[PDB]
Amino acid sequence: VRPFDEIPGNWRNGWLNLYRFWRSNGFRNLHHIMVKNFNKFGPIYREKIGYYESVNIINPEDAATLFKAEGLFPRRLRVEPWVAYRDYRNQKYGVLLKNGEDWRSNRLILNKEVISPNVIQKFVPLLNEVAQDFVSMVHKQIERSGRGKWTVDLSNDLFRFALESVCYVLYGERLGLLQDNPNPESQRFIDSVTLMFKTTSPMLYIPPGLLRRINSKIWRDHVEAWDVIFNHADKCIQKIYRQFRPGVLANLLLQGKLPIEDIKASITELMAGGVDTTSMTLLWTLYELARNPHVQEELRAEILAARQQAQGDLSKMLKSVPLLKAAIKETLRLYPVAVSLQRYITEDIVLQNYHIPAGTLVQVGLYAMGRNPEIFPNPEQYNPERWLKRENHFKSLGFGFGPRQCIGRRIAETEMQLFLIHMLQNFKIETNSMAEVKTTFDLILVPEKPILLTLRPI
Numbered sequence: 001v002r003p004f005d006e007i008p009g010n011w012r013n014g015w016l017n018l019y020r021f022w023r024s025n026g027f028r029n030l031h032h033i034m035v036k037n038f039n040k041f042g043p044i045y046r047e048k049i050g051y052y053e054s055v056n057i058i059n060p061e062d063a064a065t066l067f068k069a070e071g072l073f074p075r076r077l078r079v080e081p082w083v084a085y086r087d088y089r090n091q092k093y094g095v096l097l098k099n100g101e102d103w104r105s106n107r108l109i110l111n112k113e114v115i116s117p118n119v120i121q122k123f124v125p126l127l128n129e130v131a132q133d134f135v136s137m138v139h140k141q142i143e144r145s146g147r148g149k150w151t152v153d154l155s156n157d158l159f160r161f162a163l164e165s166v167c168y169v170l171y172g173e174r175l176g177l178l179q180d181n182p183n184p185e186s187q188r189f190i191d192s193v194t195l196m197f198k199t200t201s202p203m204l205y206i207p208p209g210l211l212r213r214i215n216s217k218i219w220r221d222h223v224e225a226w227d228v229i230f231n232h233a234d235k236c237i238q239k240i241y242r243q244f245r246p247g248v249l250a251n252l253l254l255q256g257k258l259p260i261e262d263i264k265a266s267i268t269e270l271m272a273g274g275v276d277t278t279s280m281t282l283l284w285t286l287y288e289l290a291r292n293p294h295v296q297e298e299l300r301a302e303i304l305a306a307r308q309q310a311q312g313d314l315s316k317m318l319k320s321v322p323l324l325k326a327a328i329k330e331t332l333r334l335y336p337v338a339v340s341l342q343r344y345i346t347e348d349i350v351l352q353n354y355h356i357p358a359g360t361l362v363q364v365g366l367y368a369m370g371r372n373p374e375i376f377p378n379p380e381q382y383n384p385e386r387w388l389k390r391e392n393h394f395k396s397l398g399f400g401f402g403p404r405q406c407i408g409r410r411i412a413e414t415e416m417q418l419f420l421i422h423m424l425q426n427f428k429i430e431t432n433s434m435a436e437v438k439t440t441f442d443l444i445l446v447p448e449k450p451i452l453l454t455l456r457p458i
């Protein structure tokens, strides 16, 4: 086998690479940087930028060997800003920040009430309710606008649908974000959530302790945002104990399997993990459905057929939409919520004939895989057919893979399906202009400029 010190890449000028990363852009084009590296060093490259070093792969086969050596307690990179807040406020770590035995001990409890098929069917009526209210809002706006159209940037509205839905199944209450005049308690909560995501982007590389040392507003606004999010969790917890004398939070407080401190930590991290993720995916999807109207009709045809063969039963209808679940994989292929999965190797492995010493951070380039003509034929075309009647697990890594995969993947899928089912039944999504839209990096994959979509009743 080839030694580690022979892997291609730029690990020999890490300090010059740190200069090239911050001199211009860089923190906005990490997804484009990876593609170039793979198109320059091959199916595997080793990179070092400052004190950061890692081995990267693109072939789904290599992701196999990677996930087989992650260990019993897989460890990804950490969210420095989010961890810094828990240390400052002496809060417990949730299922996302924990590692080792504590994560495993938690994950298993959380899985019974978040990802198990038993509770997924209990979430269907809840998610569908929010999905029905979103369609009502779109009709109202279309009525006002006249001519039966509504050209709008659904960015903010989709963010509200994501937050409204996740908080419905987690806390067991409707925040009312989809109204025309939401109550100030929810308007301040969504603003705090938004400010929280907006303040993490800067501290993903800039050490949080450094911004705290200079009393930067970035650090202060971050703490102020998490405070509101944690206080809204206490507000719920208190109401639930008052009602003792339903939601994920209520069931965890009933079973009394985890401490309230560990329950409050996880319930919060669960919300953060699926508010910006589901919202942007639902946006990229609506965008590609408008650039590819043939796919939108093909889906609409299948959903209308499933509506009648199911006889109202959403459970049956959700099992009868294979092309819809394939469209979700297709969106996550061109626009992955995370440009890479990270796993700290716990055993010496070999990838592409190269010894990878234990402890090494190996990343799986999801954005580069989904756009490689080799792994995916016709990559730049949105064709959900490529996923049906095909097999492929290591090609659809959008929600990760393994014991520490996305614990809310079923909640996300269900929510995104119910959304598309209700939206395609009532409206046709038309692109205001066939002009190209560019992708940038900031926490996730977001469009450079707003996406303007027209919604006509059908």
Ligand code: HEM
Pocket: 076, 095, 096, 107, 166, 269, 270, 271, 273, 274, 275, 277, 278, 281, 332, 337, 338, 341, 342, 397, 398, 399, 400, 401, 402, 404, 405, 406, 407, 408, 409, 411, 412
């Ligand atoms: C389109 C929607 C979503 C996408 C694409 C997505 C994607 C991902 C990915 C790639 C991971 C890491 C997987 C890995 O490292 O192997 C992850 C982890 C996680 N996701 Fe999501 N996610 C979505 C929605 C949600 C939702 C709705 C929730 C609700 C709780 C959620 C909660 C979490 C949590 C808590 C983790 C970390 C769990 C752990 O590390 O043990 N996500 N997600």
Ligand SMILES: CC(C)=CCC[C@@H](C)[C@H]1CC[C@H]2[C@@H]3CC=C4C[C@@H](O)CC[C@]4(C)[C@H]3CC[C@]12C
Pocket: 030, 076, 077, 078, 079, 204, 273, 337, 338, 339, 340, 342, 443
């Ligand atoms: C909730 C979810 C998305 C799961 C895991 C949580 C957490 C481990 C991940 C999610 C996104 C990561 C960044 C993503 C991309 C990059 C660019 C990479 O080329 C360099 C690293 C970097 C910035 C990652 C940093 C840590 C984050 C936030």
